[PDB]
């Protein structure tokens, strides 16, 4: 895989797992999204775009004793397609700060990753509430 | 000895040899006096006072073919005790910076122990030169 090339970096493993909770746990506080919407997936991290019905009409439930008929589907009004964007946000960490946690032990602030995260979550929201215009997308 | 203690102290002995280093060092910087005027002793930590001979008359000298007279004797014009005052400063090592290179790795600031050095060779220095009215020192 490797695209998330977290080899390169100076941070050891417990700098990344508290880089992975200050970003998770300011996520799970920020998004209102995700509290009504559910979520699907993770589906991976090369799928470039989904395929997806449209189910738009109402239609009668099948009630018989035995199930003599066909006329009760639920088919696609369309199958819409929908490219997924991608949200990010960038931030430094300077390397005084990680020679000081790995001589001193002074540890790294991740609070640049929470903040990072947060302007993520509301760009998120923005999206799926007021939809993006350029992307095409729709909310 | 051992009026002193080196073992309740928090400093490892790399630490007491700075400290002591600072101390001499600047004590050899400092003693003026010292320079001028031969150092009796040191005669030890237990000594209180010494008893010493002054010899402010001069007196007549023996000049004859046998020697037959013994009038001509040294005499201490006064003959007299002195007391060894303490000489003393405190200097106070902060906690912090002996946790700090217990654990960061910055050295200690024994600054204050060099200047507790110096203060004391300025207050030997005062003593020789001016004399203590409270103890009735000669300068």
């Given at each position: 895989m490797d695209f998330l090339d977290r080899n390169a970096a100076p941070l050891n493993e417990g700098e990344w797992q508290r880089i992975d909770e200050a970003v998770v746990s300011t996520a799970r506080r920020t998004l209102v999204?995700?509290?009504?919407?559910?979520?699907?997936g993770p589906l991976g991290s090369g799928v470039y775009s989904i395929?997806?019905?449209?189910?738009?009409?109402?239609?009668?439930t099948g009630i018989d004793m035995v199930g003599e008929n066909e006329e009760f589907?639920?088919?696609?009004?369309?199958?819409?397609?929908?490219?997924?964007?991608?949200?990010?946000?960038?931030?430094?960490?300077?390397?005084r700060d990680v020679e000081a946690d790995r001589h001193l032990g002074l540890p790294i602030d991740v609070s640049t990753a929470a903040v990072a995260g947060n302007f993520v979550a509301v760009q998120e929201d923005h999206l799926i509430f007021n939809g993006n215009v350029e992307l095409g997308h729709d909310g």
């Open positions: 999204a995700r509290r009504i919407i559910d979520v699907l395929p997806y019905s449209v189910f738009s009409g109402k239609s009668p589907v639920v088919e696609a009004s369309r199958r819409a397609t929908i490219n997924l964007p991608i949200l990010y946000k960038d931030f430094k960490i300077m390397w």
